[PDB]
Design a protein around this ligand. Sequence first.
Ligand SMILES: NC(=O)c1ccc[n+]([C@@H]2O[C@H](COP(=O)([O-])OP(=O)(O)OC[C@H]3O[C@@H](n4cnc5c(N)ncnc54)[C@H](O)[C@@H]3O)[C@@H](O)[C@H]2O)c1
Ligand SMILES: NC(=O)c1ccc[n+]([C@@H]2O[C@H](COP(=O)([O-])OP(=O)(O)OC[C@H]3O[C@@H](n4cnc5c(N)ncnc54)[C@H](O)[C@@H]3O)[C@@H](O)[C@H]2O)c1
Ligand SMILES: NC(=O)c1ccc[n+]([C@@H]2O[C@H](COP(=O)([O-])OP(=O)(O)OC[C@H]3O[C@@H](n4cnc5c(N)ncnc54)[C@H](O)[C@@H]3O)[C@@H](O)[C@H]2O)c1
Ligand SMILES: NC(=O)c1ccc[n+]([C@@H]2O[C@H](COP(=O)([O-])OP(=O)(O)OC[C@H]3O[C@@H](n4cnc5c(N)ncnc54)[C@H](O)[C@@H]3O)[C@@H](O)[C@H]2O)c1
Ligand SMILES: Nc1ncnc2c1ncn2[C@@H]1O[C@H](CO)[C@@H](O)[C@H]1O
Ligand SMILES: Nc1ncnc2c1ncn2[C@@H]1O[C@H](CO)[C@@H](O)[C@H]1O
Ligand SMILES: Nc1ncnc2c1ncn2[C@@H]1O[C@H](CO)[C@@H](O)[C@H]1O
Ligand SMILES: Nc1ncnc2c1ncn2[C@@H]1O[C@H](CO)[C@@H](O)[C@H]1O
Ligand SMILES: [Cl-]
Ligand SMILES: [Cl-]
Ligand SMILES: [Cl-]
Ligand SMILES: [Cl-]
Ligand SMILES: [Rb+]
Ligand SMILES: [Rb+]
Ligand SMILES: [Rb+]
Ligand SMILES: [Rb+]
Ligand SMILES: [Rb+]
Ligand SMILES: [Rb+]
Lengths: 417, 417, 417, 417
Amino acid sequence: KYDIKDISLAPQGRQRIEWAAREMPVLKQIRERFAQEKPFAGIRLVACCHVTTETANLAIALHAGGADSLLIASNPLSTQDDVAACLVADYGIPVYAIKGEDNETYHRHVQIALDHRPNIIIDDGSDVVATLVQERQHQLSDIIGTTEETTTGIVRLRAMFNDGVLTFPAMNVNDADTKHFYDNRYGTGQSTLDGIIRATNILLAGKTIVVAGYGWCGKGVAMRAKGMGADVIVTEISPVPAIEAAMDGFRVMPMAEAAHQGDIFITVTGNKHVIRPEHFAVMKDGAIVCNSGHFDIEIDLKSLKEQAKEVKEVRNFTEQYILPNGKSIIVIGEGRLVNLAAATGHPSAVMDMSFANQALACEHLVKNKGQLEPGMHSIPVEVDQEIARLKLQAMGIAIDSLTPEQVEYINSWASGT
Amino acid sequence: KYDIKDISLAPQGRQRIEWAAREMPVLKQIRERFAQEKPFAGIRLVACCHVTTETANLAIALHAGGADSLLIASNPLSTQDDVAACLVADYGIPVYAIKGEDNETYHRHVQIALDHRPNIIIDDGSDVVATLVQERQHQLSDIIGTTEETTTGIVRLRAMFNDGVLTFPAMNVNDADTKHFYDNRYGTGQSTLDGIIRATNILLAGKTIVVAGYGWCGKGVAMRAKGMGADVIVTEISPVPAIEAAMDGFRVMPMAEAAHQGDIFITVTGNKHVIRPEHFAVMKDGAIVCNSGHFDIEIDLKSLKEQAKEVKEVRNFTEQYILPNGKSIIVIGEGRLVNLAAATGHPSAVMDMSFANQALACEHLVKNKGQLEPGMHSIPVEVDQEIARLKLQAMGIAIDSLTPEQVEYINSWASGT
Amino acid sequence: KYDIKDISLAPQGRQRIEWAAREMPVLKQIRERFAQEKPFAGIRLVACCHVTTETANLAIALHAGGADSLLIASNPLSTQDDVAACLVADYGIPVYAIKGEDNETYHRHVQIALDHRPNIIIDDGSDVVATLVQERQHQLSDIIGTTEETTTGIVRLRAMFNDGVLTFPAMNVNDADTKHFYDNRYGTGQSTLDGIIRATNILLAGKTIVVAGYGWCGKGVAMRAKGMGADVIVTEISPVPAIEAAMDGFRVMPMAEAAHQGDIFITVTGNKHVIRPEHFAVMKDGAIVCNSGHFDIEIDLKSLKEQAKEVKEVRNFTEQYILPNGKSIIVIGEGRLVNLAAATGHPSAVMDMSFANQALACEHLVKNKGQLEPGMHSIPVEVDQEIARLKLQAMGIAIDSLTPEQVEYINSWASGT
Amino acid sequence: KYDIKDISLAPQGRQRIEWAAREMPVLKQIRERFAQEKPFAGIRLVACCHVTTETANLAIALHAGGADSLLIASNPLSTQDDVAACLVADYGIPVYAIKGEDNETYHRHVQIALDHRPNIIIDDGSDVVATLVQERQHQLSDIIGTTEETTTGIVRLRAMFNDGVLTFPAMNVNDADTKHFYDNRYGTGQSTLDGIIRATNILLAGKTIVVAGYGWCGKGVAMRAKGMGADVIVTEISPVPAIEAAMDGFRVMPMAEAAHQGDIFITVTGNKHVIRPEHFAVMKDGAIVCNSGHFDIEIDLKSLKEQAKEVKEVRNFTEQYILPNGKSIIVIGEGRLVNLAAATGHPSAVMDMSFANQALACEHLVKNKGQLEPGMHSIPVEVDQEIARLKLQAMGIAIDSLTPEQVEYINSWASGT
Ligand SMILES: NC(=O)c1ccc[n+]([C@@H]2O[C@H](COP(=O)([O-])OP(=O)(O)OC[C@H]3O[C@@H](n4cnc5c(N)ncnc54)[C@H](O)[C@@H]3O)[C@@H](O)[C@H]2O)c1
Ligand SMILES: NC(=O)c1ccc[n+]([C@@H]2O[C@H](COP(=O)([O-])OP(=O)(O)OC[C@H]3O[C@@H](n4cnc5c(N)ncnc54)[C@H](O)[C@@H]3O)[C@@H](O)[C@H]2O)c1
Ligand SMILES: NC(=O)c1ccc[n+]([C@@H]2O[C@H](COP(=O)([O-])OP(=O)(O)OC[C@H]3O[C@@H](n4cnc5c(N)ncnc54)[C@H](O)[C@@H]3O)[C@@H](O)[C@H]2O)c1
Ligand SMILES: NC(=O)c1ccc[n+]([C@@H]2O[C@H](COP(=O)([O-])OP(=O)(O)OC[C@H]3O[C@@H](n4cnc5c(N)ncnc54)[C@H](O)[C@@H]3O)[C@@H](O)[C@H]2O)c1
Ligand SMILES: Nc1ncnc2c1ncn2[C@@H]1O[C@H](CO)[C@@H](O)[C@H]1O
Ligand SMILES: Nc1ncnc2c1ncn2[C@@H]1O[C@H](CO)[C@@H](O)[C@H]1O
Ligand SMILES: Nc1ncnc2c1ncn2[C@@H]1O[C@H](CO)[C@@H](O)[C@H]1O
Ligand SMILES: Nc1ncnc2c1ncn2[C@@H]1O[C@H](CO)[C@@H](O)[C@H]1O
Ligand SMILES: [Cl-]
Ligand SMILES: [Cl-]
Ligand SMILES: [Cl-]
Ligand SMILES: [Cl-]
Ligand SMILES: [Rb+]
Ligand SMILES: [Rb+]
Ligand SMILES: [Rb+]
Ligand SMILES: [Rb+]
Ligand SMILES: [Rb+]
Ligand SMILES: [Rb+]
């Protein structure tokens, strides 16, 4: 069966899935090869992803490859109910995902997914893989391998490995070049600001925007905030990215110093409680806080709730916390991934590459069944490079190639002066 | 002895060396530790570097550490004669380097350097190390290790390794994070445009500027060309950087298509004959070509000379090649590293980090004498990270550090939802 | 009476009106004074504006001042039905505005508005003023004066004046410094991209975006498109803005050349048939065209409809036209101003200044009745400057002030050598 | 006679003058017409300009037109001695200009220039016109008219007019669209940074740069500082440019707040004592201060000299002031316009338009002698626009032209619904 909001939304989901496919040409080619080669024939698969038009196109590709797939939501607020309905009604793919579902429903959906007895698990944040290892030790004989879509998930997998419980292959999709160089940076840079603006309609120009973290996501958010006319502050914990942010023209300072100055705060660290009650207490009246890291725990909303004398919903996706002194803190999307909670996530152009990696990583797991060491594996270089070749070609961009003499010069070392 | 232009220039060199030191605080701390610990006592050292105020401060640091050093020019056009004179007259460091010296003088200087019988060779482009391996097999028992400053040199060292002749440790200074993330990118981005403008006084705004290569240097040049108002075209041979350039807002195309459009061409590829006679023949009348890769071979100037009916020097560092149809091609700095030939190279702020790596790499070689495998070694992570910590501190920038609970969250994998 | 979609939407409208007011502090101050001084007591007023949360705050300020106002939509597609419901239900202000109303309904609303016998007309695009002068010459004795919000309307007023029929005072709100320096530039720059992204979810980075016109709006749209990673082409008819665009780093060319290259076309010229059938014929398959000028006539959609062999809606606000050769053209918002048709228009921060100018322009007409010549009048400098001073204060920015010594220097001509 | 440093520099001057002419095609066209029509036959002319390769091309165009010209320096530090030598030796044009001349020599040169009894005075900063009106009332019958190149001079002319002593026509060259939209913005933006970098070699990326003034010059300097990776602070006295700076992404604050934060200070206000002792007192150790306004009086250097306990030159164009508390302030170019004092001023591409305006303004004064009122006159629109059309053509850029149908639409007011 399935567990969705409204199956009558399927026609609208189909229209939007097909619209998104227009900028997923790499995944389309993979789908067309999968439909002939059937790499997943006889394989059961669980996907824990954001239920978007882009994930739909991925599920359609795995289905064309023969996968017996079950899809559940990676986050209660990111689900697109029309997409869920189209996958069920048009493709017969079980989806357990309702926008705005409560925590008990999420956890029940994880339990249903694990009862599918998957041979492959595609995860986004590593919730299902962690539950599998914790609660389903008897099922590990089913697992051919897993994949992980996002940075937070890769961190949890390293913790599982160092703890000694990562006893199967896990594909590091997030760290492929054609994943986090584009998705994490250019995707999050546009879609994060998109979610902020759809929720608040705020003018970004002239605002001070504090970006916590200057990794791939932070670089993208800061770059686009700057492009929209914001004054950008960056916080960090490591010196190499801090120097980069300064040489990119941004102010770098500790969060305790930024807290007095920011009009908008955006967390993209992967870590817990980056924005804290001692920061809330000194923020400007009306400061906006939101999160684009995988988990809402980057903002200590539990503490905010007890500092505040009152909380009100003042717009879709927008809560106003009023403190005893009468100042307000605005929270978007209850601290959930603001690009997916208040908008539609990354454009399909970058998910084409992220989800091409997902599809080919699953294929890599199956074709190497019984042959991979336990632990984390990076995406093979030749796969990563081929995705980039196909994407560049699909964008209509042509580049150069070395001549035979240029190749010879590379291998000569006596040639200098 | 020494071989320099004019030792009466020493006072001016000293003034300029001390000016440059103001933004080399990391190297100063290393120098002050070196002067007490004397890591290089009894060690002979050859440096093949650009003879600039920044290299001078490096040589002063090695001298304080006890090194018996001899300095020669990495390039005939990059030498600063006042610096050469100050090093000889004020520090007693033999310098063999005359701005504008001919090719025979360069090669004689290399021979003199190798007769110093160095135990350590600091190289920039790998000319001296290649000559050592080619011509001085009997001297290899002297070598404790070598270092290489630039990307072109790292490529030659890989070729030496694959050929089986890299029989000693070579430190990869260029690829340290605190080297090519800053020097290669932000340094070249500013200093390349600096050299173009000092040579030509051209307005960059409104010009089409073709950047060949989108590695660390190409990213920097394109970013600053854009910042100065230029329309930027990027050429490449690999899809991952080509997609980056497009998502950074630049036009990507093959050089044969760019050749018709560019007002200024800048090569930063590391490869041979990237700009070719078939490109010259279709360039706009008055197009400017220059090179910021280590070797002038990136532009096929030999072919340009035979296509042209006439060449004239029309300004300092500036040659006009007139073709039979009357169109002109402008070449800056005879195709040598335009930032160092027509200006003063990178700012000392980034060379602080590059040359801190050089100093600590030499120390690493000495303290591990007889203990390192032959071949290339990367800069130890703890060294690289400490340089970044000290530089950030010296720039007056403070950042955050994780709390104990944040560290615990990193190592928990069961914590999701 | 009134003519709206659904009065039950009033609670949501009220909430959204209050949210927008958070960044309209200058208009709030004006409303509070109007509440005390009642400058519009006994005055009947018609407003033809986009029926948005920002217009609602203006209407509430006019209401506080005693104006007997009637509001109609400036564009069938920009109306926010929840705003219309709140103005009727909560303030008792007659609104004639239904999102998506047909042309006959819009025209009927204009007739009903003129039947209100306004003393003041606030117009956005000059439709109501033109209908008054063409059809209601017998009502001109009612008119104290009118105001005009946008550049297209000013051009119409100019033609009326040159035609001898602008026989009453008309305030040029659009050309106030605190209107078109911010609204037209920074507001359109952000909200045009907002509309495009809400409609299509497209990644802007790496796309070629053609901006027709490099006036206040074109400068903002090109600036923000570039900030979002686009490759930007600008078209023009006048050399001064064309040179500016080039020195701002954009590619300038005739539309016939741009037509082959653009992925997205945005018209902001104020002129008719800037994109024509001969341009559609050479566009890439799937090129997107939209308009941010006041009237959709900037794109020759009538010819596109005749050219095309079929048209279908492929997403909300998004139509696909298929040409007889099978290539497709995507049109957003039926060519109506894409920021208001597919999103929510400008942020309230800039509309604060635009509509402060509207409020004080209406006050100016009433306070100076019988002392203003017929024809166009600019916003008094003292008013324009006070709006800027108050907005800068409300943004929390402090600046310097001239000293007596500096004033003396300005008035001194003999000094300086 | 003449008064120059060294006539033997003429060959180098000639070469550099010819090089600069490559991007002065509009002035070349004007010179060629002047050579034919001789508009200045019998006219005596004085030019007080920066003695640069660009001014030389203007002087050559006036010479071609028959003008009996005499040229003196506009600033003791901007003079290019090789240019002065070429104008004397090759063209026989009297030049009174020595780079680094003292104040008494500058004043003597102004007296010699007025002794030429000019009919036309071209001024840059209005010193010669002010000296004429103060000291040479008996010569006013000589004057056909004057021109003024820069914003400071316009302000002086305004004060003269308000004082009743501007009794002849004076052409406002600075405020022509093709002058201050490009020269003041794009030229100053690039050449100010050029001067700073030539003097100091400092890395701009990661520095905090304070720009005083957000007019045409301030907009350009802030834009290019940001493009080079700086963190940019803007100071102002008027709210309209202050809001613009904020929405352009810069931090706006009073100079007293900026004084603690800046690494580099750049004054472009046109006003006196913008940086004062109370600012020097709180600057970072080693802060750099420079001026790109016409007169050095924007920085209170006289007070700094009194405050300081010592001063020394630490590099070409670079002085270190040491305060009694041991902190140091670095001054570039003795506070004289840093683009011309430490580099070569604007690129010839923008001076092409500025000096085309100068040439045609002088022609306008002669052709309209006896028909111009005393007081200031703007450049005729037709002249301003033709300069733009010719420059855009010479840049190789093509744009569109209105059709008959579009013209009809502009003049139609009844249409649009
Ligand atoms: N919302 C989206 O669509 C989306 C897309 C990709 C990734 N993500 C998430 O975004 C987060 C960041 O991912 P990434 O790829 O940028 O990771 P990354 O590893 O490249 O960068 C994270 C950066 O944050 C810094 N940081 C860590 N703790 C910090 C703290 N307390 N304060 C300040 N800086 C701190 C780190 O030093 C590092 O530079 C992850 O949770 C990832 O799963 C979200
Ligand atoms: N002048 C300076 O001060 C300075 C500073 C640092 C490095 N360098 C030199 O600059 C060069 C580039 O170094 P880097 O660190 O950027 O290297 P890199 O390895 O990071 O990047 C080089 C890039 O050029 C591309 N490329 C190679 N051949 C090409 C071709 N024929 N056409 C187009 N693109 C091509 C490669 O794909 C790669 O992306 C080297 O020669 C290096 O030694 C100079
Ligand atoms: N959607 C919005 O919210 C919004 C906001 C403000 C203004 N507007 C509208 O935007 C339009 C432009 O306003 P503006 O203030 O930028 O006007 P403007 O007068 O400042 O600029 C218009 C520019 O377009 C150029 N142009 C004219 N015809 C052209 C053509 N055929 N091709 C190319 N360039 C051409 C002109 O040379 C000029 O530079 C008007 O219709 C105005 O009412 C819309
Ligand atoms: N060096 C060059 O090559 C060059 C080129 C053009 C102009 N200039 C000079 O630059 C100066 C500025 O010219 P412009 O065209 O930009 O003038 P402008 O009138 O366009 O702008 C001056 C700006 O400075 C602001 N301002 C005035 N006093 C101030 C103060 N005390 N603090 C902060 N801001 C203040 C004004 O509000 C205004 O916005 C003039 O002296 C002009 O002659 C120099
Ligand atoms: N449109 C989208 N559809 C599906 N997943 C998305 C979308 N946007 C972002 N994501 C993914 O969500 C992850 C964060 O949980 C990111 O790693 C990213 O790949
Ligand atoms: N100012 C400078 N002094 C010394 N070396 C430099 C300077 N600028 C650039 N370089 C170095 O020259 C190398 C290229 O040969 C680069 O790797 C870079 O580190
Ligand atoms: N949010 C908005 N509310 C009302 N009017 C708007 C809004 N956004 C843009 N406009 C106005 O619409 C006009 C174009 O019809 C512009 O002049 C602008 O002032
Ligand atoms: N290269 C140059 N040659 C001559 N005048 C210049 C140059 N650069 C700037 N100026 C002028 O100097 C004036 C300031 O004194 C500016 O108005 C500008 O037009
Ligand atoms: Cl494939
Ligand atoms: Cl150390
Ligand atoms: Cl008021
Ligand atoms: Cl002419
Ligand atoms: Rb080689
Ligand atoms: Rb965790
Ligand atoms: Rb049709
Ligand atoms: Rb003065
Ligand atoms: Rb003193
Ligand atoms: Rb019209």
